[PDB]
Amino acid sequence: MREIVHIQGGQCGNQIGAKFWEVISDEHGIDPTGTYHGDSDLQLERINVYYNEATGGRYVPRAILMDLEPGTMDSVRAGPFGQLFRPDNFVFGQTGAGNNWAKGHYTEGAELIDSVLDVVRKEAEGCDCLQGFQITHSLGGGTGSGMGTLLISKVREEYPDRIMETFSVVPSPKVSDTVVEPYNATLSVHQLVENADECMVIDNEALYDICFRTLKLTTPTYGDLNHLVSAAMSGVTCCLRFPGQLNSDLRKLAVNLIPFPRLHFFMIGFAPLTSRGSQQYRALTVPELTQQMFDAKNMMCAADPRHGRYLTASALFRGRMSTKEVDEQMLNVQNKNSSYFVEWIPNNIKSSICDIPPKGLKMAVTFVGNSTAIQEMFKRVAEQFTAMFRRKAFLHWYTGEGMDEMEFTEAESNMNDLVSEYQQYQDATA
Amino acid sequence: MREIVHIQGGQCGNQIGAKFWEVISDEHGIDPTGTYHGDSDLQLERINVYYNEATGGRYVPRAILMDLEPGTMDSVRAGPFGQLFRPDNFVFGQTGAGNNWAKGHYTEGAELIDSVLDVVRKEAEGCDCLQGFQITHSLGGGTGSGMGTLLISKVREEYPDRIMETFSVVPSPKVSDTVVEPYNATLSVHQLVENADECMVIDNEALYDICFRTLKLTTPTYGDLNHLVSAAMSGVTCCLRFPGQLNSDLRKLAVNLIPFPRLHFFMIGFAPLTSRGSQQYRALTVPELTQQMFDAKNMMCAADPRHGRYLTASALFRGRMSTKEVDEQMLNVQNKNSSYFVEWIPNNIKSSICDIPPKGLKMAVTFVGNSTAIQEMFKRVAEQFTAMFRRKAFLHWYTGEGMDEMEFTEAESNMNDLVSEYQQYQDATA
Amino acid sequence: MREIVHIQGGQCGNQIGAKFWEVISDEHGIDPTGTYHGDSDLQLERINVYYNEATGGRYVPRAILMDLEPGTMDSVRAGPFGQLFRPDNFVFGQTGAGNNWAKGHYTEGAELIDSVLDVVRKEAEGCDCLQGFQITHSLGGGTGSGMGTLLISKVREEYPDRIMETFSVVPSPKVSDTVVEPYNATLSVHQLVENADECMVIDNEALYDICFRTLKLTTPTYGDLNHLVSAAMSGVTCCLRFPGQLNSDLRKLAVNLIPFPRLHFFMIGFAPLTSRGSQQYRALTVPELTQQMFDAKNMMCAADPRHGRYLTASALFRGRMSTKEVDEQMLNVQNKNSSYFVEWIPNNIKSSICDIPPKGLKMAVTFVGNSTAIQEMFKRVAEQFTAMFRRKAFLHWYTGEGMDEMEFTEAESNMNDLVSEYQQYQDATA
Amino acid sequence: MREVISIHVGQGGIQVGNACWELFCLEHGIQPDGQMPSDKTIGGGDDAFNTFFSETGAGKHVPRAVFLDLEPTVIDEVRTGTYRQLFHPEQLISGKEDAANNFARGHYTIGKEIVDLCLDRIRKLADNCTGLQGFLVFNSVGGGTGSGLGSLLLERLSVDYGKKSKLGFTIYPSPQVSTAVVEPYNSILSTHSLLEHTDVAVMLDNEAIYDICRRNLDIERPTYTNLNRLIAQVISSLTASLRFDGALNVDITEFQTNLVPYPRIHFMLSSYAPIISAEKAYHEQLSVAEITNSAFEPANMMAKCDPRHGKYMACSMMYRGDVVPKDVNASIATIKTKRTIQFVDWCPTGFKVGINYQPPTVVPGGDLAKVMRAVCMISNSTAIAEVFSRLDHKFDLMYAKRAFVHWYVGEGMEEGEFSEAREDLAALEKDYEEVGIET
Amino acid sequence: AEKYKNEQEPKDNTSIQRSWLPYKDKALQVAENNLIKNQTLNQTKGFTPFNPLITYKNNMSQVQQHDIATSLPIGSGEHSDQKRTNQPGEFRHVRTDVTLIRNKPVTK
Amino acid sequence: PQFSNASQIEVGDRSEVNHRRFVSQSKNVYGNFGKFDPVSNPGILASKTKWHHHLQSK
């Protein structure tokens, strides 16, 4: 019943998947070895969404892990929770992507998709009625974006009526992590927009920024980064898995968050998140949460929403709460902030209610909104790209594996076209 | 309902605020370790006036703590009863004011006041129906005179309806703590009169005079002085926390005491006060308290009323009492001293009663004074300012941080204008 | 219909007109070739105020360029928008003025000023009915102050009914440019005082201060400074080219600012001028426009107006906005700062509203006011000049070109009277 | 399963590896004889040492390296030293007649009878491997024997293996102190040899290392053994990430795609820090902020070139120890905001950040102290032009008088070759200038 | 705002000096128990830092090791609970059985 | 060296597409007279009257 097969690739892909399963593992209360120890009946009624069936009652995740180099996969197997994944889904190369897109999209990527593409089809057919996919990868990384985009491209050609999702991490110009990031980041979206129904952009800079001024822990590590994203990934599917007042499936978010087929980029943020020292000095009431969701700071997106002019957005609450203050507040914030919302889309906010809070709290908020501000990333991503192209700098590598200059310019035109539309759908009056 | 706010800035502001919060916690029944150990049900009836609610029944005070030097925040936090305050309410810089007004209102404050305004706005809007603001600051110091006043202008401009309270410890020529005290204080009066609706000055030298004579204690320290003020402003807000025969609120106090908008300066006092020697030898009746209330040395400001005439004065009694005695005593003092009360306003004394007195006494009285004697206080500071300014001594610091001598001359003119306009009524006759 | 003419004397007139004709073209939408590429019909509705029609639909700015230096004049021609000037108007000498007044007013300039007289007269009849002359020159420079003034002197001779206006850039004390500074600025006012109907002095430092404080631009250039005025120039005549609630031609401003015939000097300033990194937020609502307008820091003249009293005030709101706040804020500001406004001119502020603001804004205002402050400007210049005479240095050049001691003395007494007569009404009481 | 093959040729190369392999020996606990000293070693997934050493079926290990030289004394020195039992007996090929500083001798006359064996031995090593990544070549440019056998072996590599990635740490004579008087000749002739047959090379002129060592360890009288250890440090750094667990990784194949913008410009200079002796060691904080600055400092350049005269092209950073991501993010933030160092207009982001966990080890009886934070840097900057021009001058002056040319015509090498080489060096100077201009 | 000098002398008791208020001043009594209770806790651990003062900043806070159900259970931080040695070969690879291929299958 | 003025203040923010930028309020305010059918329910007129102002304001 609408089970979703989760696939992630790339070193950045592995860690997100490496720990994201930890959050979902704790929600349904599955132990490291795969034996159930739940407390209530509900937590095991709707468990077919993520887990298959196996002898001894042990449950294995329907995950596909993909990477081209041995370092990433081996480490994830050694850590805790590393025994759940079955050895069959594993697929790996023997050469290495080398942070070159083409080496990951035409030569090395092509000569291995046959093996990977075989396992994915097996999982899809296994489900009673496939409901969609969900991919996490890295646009600035090689193996992630290298063949990660291509797999997404082929999948669309085979399953047209399904729904597609993506959690892409694109480098921000604040902290640089690869000299060639502008190239592989700029040309990946071109193959991304035409094929990805939904995309959710999360930039590491925002994740780092949130750490200091929300949680206030002196020294953060990558472990902290994964956990924040891990929960947010659950917010989109929060109501889908447990009973609630107003259910909302994955498509329902698509129906109410896509003004046009060519605008499929949002930003995700998680509330509440209060510092350790402020653990007990706060009130867990509806009024407090609403401020955190719409605040310019909390969004994990490099683009500040306040420069923007919202088109549509959604809210996914969790835990037992009344319906007045979920509804009444939604009216207040919109009315008092009508200067930042579209004036030709009345009642442009979606509300859902589910009554099983995350382990250790009593209220939560998962926001995924589409603000015209998301244009900010593309303008800066391309801007640095143009400076690197006028000199044909570093271009010799990309011309040694079959790609020609035609794709580069053609991809550039597509991105610039996407930038224009956002502005057009804002500077207009009824 | 009718809830208020507290903003304390500078070293003196922090000290006075900490003492006041300690006293209020004592009165209401709040323990450091926050849980409720109060006995009477009356205390929890209206505890929302100065406190919110938080998960776990732990009360938090709606205070704001701010300063440009780290020690003051660190010192109050380390001490007991400073652990009630919200760390999120902590905002500060790392430069220091160094007894420079311009350093407190133009260069540094502008960069840090942005954060402070947000906290105050959110906290205030959180509550249902505000009643006003009571701010603690100092005019002779560096940080308090500038940072608080700048906050004052912005808050008043944003919220033009709710009244405001201010507690200023003006310097006196008896005991001095800064060689440039006149400047920052004198410029303070220029800006504060136009906005601060209610101001109740406090003079230190009166503290030592009152401390030495009536109390007779051999070795007093800062804890002794700060404690008294906490009593006065805790009593000024007594009816708004407890029931009574005739409730009187802040707005009531201002309406019955300020004849004209430019005359909004008051002086206060506290009673009963007894030296350790003769504690148990005297009773508790309206006669004794009323006799001590009007005494020249019982006031809390350096001004001596006997050289001036009161315009309006209100008494906020506490605890049970026989009303007829309250009325009779007030008239008797009025009639026997007609020379000290101006004539063209009949019945220039107010009264009020509340049903709960401070713990540990049968009754107490809090007195607010609005008499022409406040002219002398400003006059002496004006005398110092002119002498210090004629030679332009110490003027280079303030000339080198964007300020202009035009503003100094305007402020000096304004103080004289207020002095004249306020002393006019002493000789003015119907 | 109701058109004016432009006479720029010298490079200052060259550059000031160099940019202003550059700035205006955008406002009315004229390309570098003089070909219309506008959008709305209104833009050509009153394009005839400054432009003349010719075969081929090209427009022509009716300006005449005057100077005694060929090195500077030609420079504008090579630059953009320098071809808007017809070559016929090009009139120029061959030797220069050498920063010596006499060489530009009695021997050389008087020899060549005839030709410009013919062209200036020729341009007059071309229009339907002449409306006035607005002239930009330099008092601190010889060439402009040498033969410029003589041009202004006789222009009013042939049209005793038409009015003439002047932009003056006068020497300032902090930064000096010419050692003939005391002489050229001092005597020159003698002819301009009795000739120019309106003089609006402007001081160069203020640009630096305005650019250093509000502009915050690290490195201004003469081009940047030229722009500041260029907008300023458009403020005086803005309501002369489009519809408006209360259109105020150059006549109305003249009758509303001069209290008495001899006082024809004004001080102006432009705003708002946001910083370079002005974040996109809020909107320049009416409330903020008034405050920045009257700031002493924004005034373009070195003398701070608060040192005296305002004789009257004139404001020109730009954009679409109601006048109630124009009626109130213009009235509201007067009451609060009435200590600086003279008595016997009740309601001493004018209001004007236009519907065509500068491109890239929503509201704005240009400030024109006459206040006793300018006394400092002529005073301190007077002291510099007075020290020069008995000094009797640098006079041999001025005594060697046909004039003698009698001429210099008369002006000084004239200006000594002017300073006195400007101060007599400052202390007058009603 | 990942393995590499090292190549060192020439006396200087012979000794430099000696120091590096001593470090490599101690890093993985291999005993000097070749047996595991722990005696607790277990099987399964502990073969992380395959990167340099290889199991021999029974007992000891062999270092997957080859030593080639034409002069017997240096090679025999390792044979009878304490390290005797380690190397494979026949993998240390030795010659009979020395080249004698004549580049012609080492590349046309005697060199052709020893390269044949060298290729064969490399054939034996590679076949054993399974995931061959690339080679590492060390050579002494300022010598006739080093260049010839050092060069000729490279061309043979270009045709037999093909696209395999390859790196070289050349040592060009110093600007003002150098041993050989004929150093400029074979040096320039080498410049052609490796320009279009090597992908990457780092400049390690010996003069700087004396400068770096003098200013850090306080030692006034270093010997050639001292210089060797530091170079042994850099080699360990550049390859360390390949063979230990980490959060962010860079491999040998990664470097060639983030440091060479064009095929022609393939030169870059490295730097090291901190290098703090035992005495001064304790009295600091070794904080990331202070460490990162020291690396960019001109005082630490291992090639006698000052980046200040020109602009930077692309810099790669490899950290090791207990560094944390925030520490790095601020550091790169600080460096860019400064003004002393500036970049070209066509490289918006040019930093490649790597992170490891295993701290560097301290060689016994050495000079480097024991520290937890370190930085190994390999930067390609337009300033590298200084090395060639200074060499550019020295070559031309001899030819004008045709001094010493006659022993270069005594082995059959044509007189015209010198003309060809001089042209190519001119081209390389041309290209370096062009990349640095503004758009 | 004062130094808690506790002694017999009536001029430096504070306690004997801050009883002129209407009631028993809530300040001295609460302060005293803090000094006593901290000593007992230290004895449980053992600090003897030459005085109770060096132990009087971080023995009174109530921030529990676990959240109070107001934020994500991210913990105090991964680096907080990290123990590290510094010997050679500590952090070597493991090559788990997932990628431990031995035979290299030839036929597809 | 950027010759000539090289003015770069950019007083106007620019990029603001005020499609009603050059529309004189003296025109529309007197001559809109649009929609507002002959409906009798006061609210129905009320809302339709409610909208017209907003568009005029913007």
Ligand SMILES: Nc1nc2c(ncn2[C@@H]2O[C@H](COP(=O)(O)OP(=O)(O)OP(=O)(O)O)[C@@H](O)[C@H]2O)c(=O)[nH]1
């Ligand atoms: N850094 C460093 N360089 C060395 C060392 N020993 C020799 N060299 C280099 O070697 C150069 C001299 O040529 P070598 O390589 O020693 O001698 P060769 O290559 O065997 O040439 P032939 O003597 O003709 O056989 C010097 O310029 C040094 O730069 C050393 O211990 N450390």
Ligand SMILES: Nc1nc2c(ncn2[C@@H]2O[C@H](COP(=O)(O)OP(=O)(O)O)[C@@H](O)[C@H]2O)c(=O)[nH]1
């Ligand atoms: N926030 C975060 N970013 C990561 C993590 N792991 C990798 N990345 C990002 O991934 C980028 C490098 O990806 P890379 O390993 O080259 O991708 P691949 O080549 O496809 O394997 C870096 O710029 C990081 O910003 C992680 O755990 N957290």
Ligand SMILES: Nc1nc2c(ncn2[C@@H]2O[C@H](COP(=O)(O)OP(=O)(O)O)[C@@H](O)[C@H]2O)c(=O)[nH]1
């Ligand atoms: N009554 C009383 N006055 C104090 C106390 N502490 C400081 N003051 C007064 O505050 C003034 C110093 O102001 P200051 O805190 O330096 O202002 P700031 O520099 O802006 O923070 C001195 O003149 C003191 O008279 C106190 O504990 N009690």
Ligand SMILES: Nc1nc2c(ncn2[C@@H]2O[C@H](COP(=O)(O)OP(=O)(O)O)[C@@H](O)[C@H]2O)c(=O)[nH]1
């Ligand atoms: N505001 C402004 N003033 C200028 C500019 N150029 C010159 N001046 C002023 O003109 C005065 C000297 O004029 P001058 O050079 O003698 O004019 P010229 O002799 O006709 O070329 C100086 O005091 C300057 O302050 C400019 O671009 N902007």
Ligand SMILES: [Mg+2]
């Ligand atoms: Mg009219």
Ligand SMILES: [Mg+2]
């Ligand atoms: Mg040799």
